[PDB]
């Protein structure tokens, strides 16, 4: 295979124009030039995560008439597939069971419970924040950002040394870096601890302007 080390320093995202892609900029090592150079890596196909809370019973959406059959997990999985996904044009998604804990201000939520974890790609639209349905009472994770989700999932705490697995080449230069790379899924990035930080390049500058005598404007 192929894997290389990286030292990231900054990150960037553009939700409005390129959904589901996160850039990472930093330092990489080259033996031939015996110095560290700049590099950028693209992580793509970051999918949203949504947590659906199953309702403790069913509730009719007219007057809250609970007719009688208890709510099972399969009901919640079917409900999103048949109605919610169709209503908001969701093509592909993967769902599974999870167990989660809640200890915050939103009421009518148990301390420990089983939820429905659903995931779908970043190109589909976004559900409303207050969606409700037959078998689910509330939904969490609607408006999470891609950068936050990446850092919280991959357990990155500030600058660190990273292993990037299976790099691919880019069609055209997207960054002014001397080196470029890309990855297909966030699972291919990992953190290591036993390396000292590399040196950096520091630039300072000063500027002097002058207000034009005739017109009001500042020229450097």
List the helices and strands and how they pair.
Elements: E1 3-14, E2 18-30, E3 35-43, E4 48-54, H1 73-87, E5 94-101, E6 112-120, E7 136-140, H2 146-154, E8 161-165, E9 179-183, E10 189-192, E11 210-211, E12 218-219
Parallel strand pairs: 3-9
Antiparallel strand pairs: 1-2, 1-8, 2-3, 4-6, 4-7, 5-6, 8-10, 11-12
Describe this structure in words.
The protein has 220 residues and is mainly β. 11% of the residues lie in helices and 37% in strands. It is built from two helices and twelve strands; from the N terminus they run E-E-E-E-H-E-E-E-H-E-E-E-E-E. It has helices spanning 73-87, 146-154, and strands at residues 3-14, 18-30, 35-43, 48-54, 94-101, 112-120, 136-140, 161-165, 179-183, 189-192, 210-211, 218-219. The strands form three sheets. A six-stranded mixed beta sheet has the order 9-3-2-1-8-10. A four-stranded antiparallel beta sheet has the order 5-6-4-7, covered by helices on one side. A two-stranded antiparallel sheet has the order 11-12. Strand 1 (3-14) and strand 2 form a beta hairpin. It is classed as replication.
Keyphrases for this structure?
elongated, six-stranded mixed β-sheet, 220 residues, mainly beta, 1 chains, 11% helix, four-stranded antiparallel β-sheet
